[PDB]
Design a protein around this ligand. Structure first.
Ligand SMILES: CCCCCCCCCCCCCCCCCC(=O)OC[C@H](COP(=O)(O)O)OC(=O)CCCCCCCCCCCCCCCCC
Ligand SMILES: CCCCCCCCCCCCCCCCCC(=O)OC[C@H](COP(=O)(O)O)OC(=O)CCCCCCCCCCCCCCCCC
Ligand SMILES: CCCCCCCC[C@H](CCCCCCC(=O)O)C(CCCCCC)CCCCCCCCC(=O)O
Ligand SMILES: CCCCC[C@@H](CCCCCCCCCC(=O)O)[C@@H](CCC)CCCCCCCCCCCC(=O)O
Ligand SMILES: CCCCCCCCCCCCCCCC(=O)O
Ligand SMILES: CCCCCCCCCCCCCCCC(=O)O
Ligand SMILES: CCCCCCCCCCCCCCCC(=O)O
Ligand SMILES: CCCCCCCCCCCCCCCC(=O)O
Ligand SMILES: CCCCCCCCCCCCCCCC(=O)O
Ligand SMILES: CCCCCCCCCCCCCCCC(=O)O
Ligand SMILES: CCCCCCCCCCCCCCCC(=O)O
Ligand SMILES: CCCCCCCCCCCCCCCC(=O)O
Ligand SMILES: CCCCCCCCCCCCCCCC(=O)O
Ligand SMILES: CCCCCCCCCCCCCCCC(=O)O
Ligand SMILES: CCCCCCCCCCCCCCCC(=O)O
Ligand SMILES: CCCCCCCCCCCCCCCC(=O)O
Ligand SMILES: [Ca+2]
Ligand SMILES: [Ca+2]
Ligand SMILES: [Ca+2]
Ligand SMILES: [Ca+2]
Ligand SMILES: [Ca+2]
Ligand SMILES: [Ca+2]
Lengths: 639, 639
């Protein structure tokens, strides 16, 4: 029935097309699994045991990574007044009973995942791999740190759990390779940036020693390097230069010129470079993906010929199309695609195919023809009861007006909830959960499970959906109604006036899970530093606190006293909304100026990753939507 | 001796090459001046009288445009307590004696400039031109508004003086054509932006009616459209949602998600479109410049042939090269540049050149060969005294080691001023002005005046230089020293690690006088509205003032009470440094909510002009520096 498990046959024609399939969605086979003379050994039976059991790991990888808000402050134990939540968080900290029990679950599924591939690698290959060397070394640190915390330094567990989580998921590991290639270009331009403040912190220190400014703010030199740095951010534009503006108006024409050159040229010209190297790293990554295509299709070509003369005949290629489980038609499609595929010299009558010549053909059936779909029938015991009865169900759903009725009836679904909100006031709340699950139970069986996972954001829907079922067993549904109308703006994207915008903006939701995943990881590093470095300062009873800007502006909850409060407090520093409130606080709270180098180290690293990974990527991928909108209507007219 | 004035001869070969010169720097000749059968009539004698006398107009155009800070508040006359400078400016307002005297100068040189091209256009052409029609109509309003002031409404003079000044200078007029072509794309995407606030102002109004938030901030719906708009700017990130964060921590996950989608996607996806249409408007402007090349070189081709059979012979083309007066020796360089120019007809062997074929040749001598230089000798009475003696001078300066000694001895020039600063404490200040003018008096005589004007930013230097001489006749020299070391960072751009950055940043100083000129003009519109609309509100003795954020944050010097205080207040609103202090003030000072639509109109219009004309242009022009750096080393190796 299916095409999933078949690595045990894997004939001349059987799994050879699935090798050609792995160019299409580009799944990975390890090069050693491609290296073998059989290339389908007992090792590879274990390899496909991973990619079926993969989503077990995201109930580890996210599970390990989100442990860190649930953990304690570093220092409640020296403290007095412990259990007072003076500005702390709301999640309960897991005590040493609940500490260790969560971690035996965690270090199990690591060791299964990390010592998985020796099932399909040689030990001299596993233990040689520099990527693998780090992840095993990151295991043992946790494997130590679990065992030490049982019997019971600054506790470097939670720095590692990020770096396991970065290296584990292939998006975040692919992403981070760029910031080895970008970083050699970014750091050289940073020396030219760092020069721009220093040159222009020097003049305004020199210029305003004489006036009221050096009496007030610009006392030290490094108290101008501090201040004219904050003007480069412009979260401080009038408050810096009031007493230079108040005395003579002609000091604005300095500061309105420095900020102007600072923001509107340089922070574009940092963006210009970081957008320029991102172009060159993206292709160098992409051509690093197509050698994985060519080193797959070489295996797809080398599996065919036994003589390995370098050539496959047309019927020898048509028998691939017959073993393709093909679309519906094969009389002359290769004969149709002879000249249509870019170049054939057509020397011999049919049987002139080179190793390069095939690599266009499997991509052409992927791009234009879109031939294949995996049924994935059943497990074999209830199958025939349901395989007959599915033809009385899945006749209904595969009818596309009913598929439009999946869009049409989804309009009805949110309409009842508005009036029912008031009238439930004038459990009953769990009753409407049954209506929500019902529509999504249908198309799972129509599609198939990973066929449901291949769908765009309906993938993301069932991610939301089951937790809604889980969250009701342990009001909010009112605010959770909005996800239904959220996909009705996916009917806005067919509007031609507003197309290439929402063509981007919906495509850019899966396109920025890596590059916004990494930024979430960088915060989980910077928070865990702020927990350890800046932990217990903002007290109830601190008297150096209340004269600082966190008290006047009342941002006391934006605080590093725990982990999750520091997790939000990084976010405003990431946004640049009044981010100097914290920087001028902790220069007074820790009391010395080495705390300043925390937040600048945030800025230099964030305004790579913002100017790179968010901002510069959209201006690429909008152009991918744009020309594929234009060259759909161009080659809708052209050929 | 000279090559300037020669439109009175203009032989078959004489001014014909100067037609080919007018493709090189691309100066403009009007199409009617190209239309004529003579094309060098008595009209065109007056046309070159303009472009020599052009810099007389910038002592009008800047003169007219900078008049507006020197003028009065709209309303001191109803007021009590006039001559108290309660938060006012510092420039003296020109009284009605000095008001009119400045304007007879001004309306003279307009009328000379505006009724100039009747000297070279027909009356049915001058008065048909709608680009001319507006400027004449803008004259008469000022011609009225001067005469009304002499014989003693809201005084719409100063709106016009900008719009004369925009249409007068060809940079600002070329720029503004784009924002007719961009605006049809920008406004359609704005309706999708405007939708994003409204959709998401609606939820947080709905979501937080129940909690503390709707008690505090989110009372009205339109008081969330107000606030969630300011979160789109993020000049207000924690202060908006404290009491939604203070009560339940889980309401940050709204706001940290809304801002995230708001800033990092949409304000890139406004930038992506506005950078995309700027690409398409720039080329459409540029191909609008090359038809001006082709409709010049058609005149350059049509002036040659008397039979107009369509062909020019090789010697008939070589006699251009002899008349060109730009190379050393020319026996077979046409024969060198035959096949080197992309395609030759070569039919009737040396003599078959099409109208298209020449257009590469005139561009090739400008680009690659580049042997033109205009001598511009003297006026004819002191000429031979100096022209003989210049060969005893300009033997020195055109020697390239002395040209490096213009770079080398300029390094010495700033060094003495640091120690001399302290020792002048222990007029003498005007003595060091003589050293500064001296070095720039040299190369002018070596180059020539407009030859000095063709230079990159040394052009800008003499603009600085003479006002220094003027400003000393009517301390600051210390801060004026810095312009010498300012050009030593032009010896940093030859460093290969930092080249393509400063290749941009120095080329982008002339490249953003238009697109930062327009933004300067938009403020002079918005200030003049703020003078008239928001003029006299911020009193000394206002009692609704001191409880507002302009008093607490103490930005009281940033009113638009006068003109130039509102010129600078618009700067901070352009930067986005605490710009909601003003918006929440003037909603209390004028007291009703129509003042809000002032500052949003400043946002929507400027965050086109920032995201367009500043930001998106740099990411183009950095790529122009980048590939011309690469394809200098590529075709330094290739051909
Ligand atoms: C707080 C909870 C966060 C929830 C976010 C859920 C994201 C769902 C991802 C689940 C899939 C795990 C696969 C990731 C890597 C393994 C292989 C692979 O390449 O799959 C690619 C996967 C699709 O490929 P396939 O499913 O393997 O076929 O693409 C993705 O969508 C996920 C890529 C990165 C996911 C982790 C990074 C982001 C997580 C943290 C987010 C924090 C805040 C972000 C705010 C942005 C708001 C817009
Ligand atoms: C406050 C005083 C501002 C001083 C700025 C000086 C501006 C230089 C003007 C040069 C002479 C006037 C020519 C412009 C009219 C078009 C004719 C032409 O082709 O010349 C183009 C000229 C070069 O071409 P050429 O000299 O004719 O060969 O290019 C330019 O450099 C000037 C182009 C626009 C000038 C007016 C717009 C800007 C003025 C307002 C500045 C305020 C904001 C600037 C802040 C940014 C800081 C980095
Ligand atoms: C590079 C851009 C990355 C975006 C920055 C991180 C976003 C901040 C989110 C975490 C902090 C809020 C947690 C509040 C905890 C508390 O104070 O109780 C955060 C990420 C959410 C996932 C998608 C957003 C980007 C975590 C949200 C969890 C909320 C927990 C609140 C507890 C509720 C209770 O009362 O128990
Ligand atoms: C879109 C961004 C445009 C950038 C240009 C901005 C100004 C740069 C320098 C121009 C200076 C003009 C001086 C004219 C003299 C006068 O009218 O006062 C600039 C645009 C803001 C974005 C605005 C800032 C200019 C403010 C000038 C104030 C000087 C007042 C001095 C009076 C007191 C005295 O001289 O004694
Ligand atoms: C581009 C650099 C040029 C100007 C460089 C400025 C470096 C000056 C360093 C001085 C540091 C502090 C000076 C006075 C304060 C003190 O005595 O410590
Ligand atoms: C990247 C440029 C600056 C980065 C962070 C700003 C550093 C400015 C210097 C800090 C304060 C100056 C030294 C204090 C003087 C003192 O000890 O009295
Ligand atoms: C990689 C490091 C980045 C650069 C860090 C900036 C180092 C300069 C620190 C400035 C301190 C100068 C203040 C001394 C003057 C004084 O205290 O009187
Ligand atoms: C993923 C890499 C980890 C990043 C580097 C972490 C170590 C840098 C500084 C750590 C602590 C610095 C301050 C310690 C002072 C203290 O504990 O009181
Ligand atoms: C990675 C770039 C970070 C840049 C910021 C560096 C922090 C420098 C701190 C400057 C403080 C001045 C030195 C005196 C220290 C002290 O007085 O305690
Ligand atoms: C991607 C990881 C980046 C890591 C850089 C962050 C570490 C720089 C500063 C951390 C805290 C140092 C300042 C603490 C001052 C103190 O000891 O009191
Ligand atoms: C995308 C739009 C969907 C939601 C649109 C929300 C429009 C609601 C309009 C209500 C305005 C004020 C409502 C209560 C205040 C009043 O009674 O005036
Ligand atoms: C572009 C989106 C918004 C633009 C400016 C914000 C408009 C907010 C609405 C004004 C405040 C509330 C309206 C009146 C309420 C009242 O009169 O009580
Ligand atoms: C081109 C115009 C842009 C759109 C301008 C905003 C239009 C909506 C104004 C919001 C007012 C709604 C407030 C009414 C609710 C109330 O006062 O109770
Ligand atoms: C260059 C175009 C000019 C811009 C438009 C100018 C007129 C728009 C509004 C002008 C005044 C606004 C209302 C005046 C109220 C008052 O005078 O009290
Ligand atoms: C050009 C776009 C500007 C958008 C801002 C529009 C200003 C709308 C003002 C909203 C105020 C609510 C209406 C009530 C007026 C009043 O009470 O005086
Ligand atoms: C490029 C020119 C843009 C012109 C747009 C600015 C005019 C919009 C609002 C001007 C002031 C209107 C608000 C004043 C309300 C009042 O009279 O109190
Ligand atoms: Ca073979
Ligand atoms: Ca054939
Ligand atoms: Ca900001
Ligand atoms: Ca001829
Ligand atoms: Ca020839
Ligand atoms: Ca304050």
């Amino acid at each position: 029935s299916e095409a999933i498990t078949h690595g045990t046959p894997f004939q001349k024609a059987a799994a050879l097309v699935d090798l050609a399939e792995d160019g299409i969605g580009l799944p990975v086979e390890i090069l050693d699994q491609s290296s073998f003379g059989e290339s389908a050994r007992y090792y590879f039976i274990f390899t496909r045991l991973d990619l079926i059991w993969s989503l077990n790991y995201f109930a580890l990888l996210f599970l390990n990574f989100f442990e860190q808000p649930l953990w304690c402050e570093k220092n409640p134990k020296p403290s007095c007044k412990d259990r007072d939540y003076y500005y702390l968080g709301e999640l309960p900290y897991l005590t040493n009973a609940e500490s260790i029990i969560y971690e035996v679950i965690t270090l199990a599924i690591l060791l299964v995942h990390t010592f998985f591939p020796i099932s399909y690698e040689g030990s001299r290959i596993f233990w040689t791999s520099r990527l693998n060397l780090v992840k095993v070394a990151c295991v043992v640190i946790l494997f130590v740190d679990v065992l030490v915390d049982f019997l019971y330094p600054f506790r470097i567990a939670p720095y590692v759990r990020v770096i396991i989580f970065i290296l584990s998921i292939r998006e975040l590991r692919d992403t981070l390779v760029l910031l080895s290639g970008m970083l050699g270009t970014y750091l050289n331009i940073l020396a030219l940036w760092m020069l721009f403040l220093l040159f222009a912190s020097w003049i305004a220190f020199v210029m305003f020693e004489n006036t009221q400014q050096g009496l007030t703010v610009f006392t030290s030199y490094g108290a101008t390097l501090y201040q004219m740095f904050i003007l480069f951010t412009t979260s401080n534009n009038p408050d810096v230069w009031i007493p230079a503006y108040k005395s003579s108006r002609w000091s604005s024409v300095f500061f309105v010129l420095y900020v102007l050159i600072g923001v509107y040229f340089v922070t574009n010209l940092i963006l210009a470079v970081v957008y320029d190297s991102f172009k060159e790293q993206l292709a160098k990554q992409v051509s690093g993906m197509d050698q994985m295509k060519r080193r797959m299709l070489e295996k797809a070509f080398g599996l065919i010929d036994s003589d390995k003369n370098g050539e496959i005949d047309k019927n020898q290629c048509i028998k691939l199309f017959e073993q393709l489980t093909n679309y519906r038609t094969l009389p002359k499609i290769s004969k149709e695609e002879f000249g249509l595929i870019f170049d054939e010299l057509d020397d011999t009558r049919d049987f002139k195919i080179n190793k390069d010549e095939f690599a266009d053909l499997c991509q052409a059936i992927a791009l234009r023809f879109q031939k294949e779909e995996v049924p994935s029938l059943f497990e074999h015991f209830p199958q025939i009861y349901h395989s007959a009865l599915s033809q009385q169900l899945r006749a209904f759903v595969r009818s596309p007006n009913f598929g439009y009725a999946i869009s049409f009836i989804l309009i009805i679904n949110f309409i009842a909830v508005v009036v029912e909100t008031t009238l439930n006031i004038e459990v009953a709340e769990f009753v409407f959960g049954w209506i929500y699950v019902l529509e999504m139970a249908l198309k799972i069986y129509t599609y198939g499970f990973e066929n449901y996972w291949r769908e765009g954001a309906n993938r993301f829907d069932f991610l939301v959906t089951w937790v809604i079922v889980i969250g009701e067993t342990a009001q909010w549904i009112r605010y959770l109604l909005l996800a239904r109308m959220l996909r009705l703006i996916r009917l806005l994207m067919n509007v031609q006036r507003y197309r290439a915008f929402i063509a981007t903006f919906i495509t850019l939701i899966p396109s920025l899970m890596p590059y916004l995943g990494t930024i979430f990881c960088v915060l989980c590093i910077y928070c865990s530093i702020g927990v350890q470095v800046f932990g217990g300062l903002v007290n109830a009873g601190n008297k150096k606190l209340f004269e600082t800007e966190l008290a006047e502006d009342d941002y006391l909850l934006f605080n590093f006293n725990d982990y999750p409060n520091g997790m939000v407090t990084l976010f405003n520093l990431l946004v640049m909304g009044n981010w100097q409130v914290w920087m001028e606080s902790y220069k007074d709270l820790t009391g010395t100026w080495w705390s300043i180098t925390y937040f600048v180290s945030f800025y230099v690293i964030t305004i790579l990753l913002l100017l790179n990974l968010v901002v510069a990527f959209v201006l690429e991928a909008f152009f991918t939507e744009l020309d594929l909108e234009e060259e759909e209507k161009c080659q809708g007219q052209d050929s």
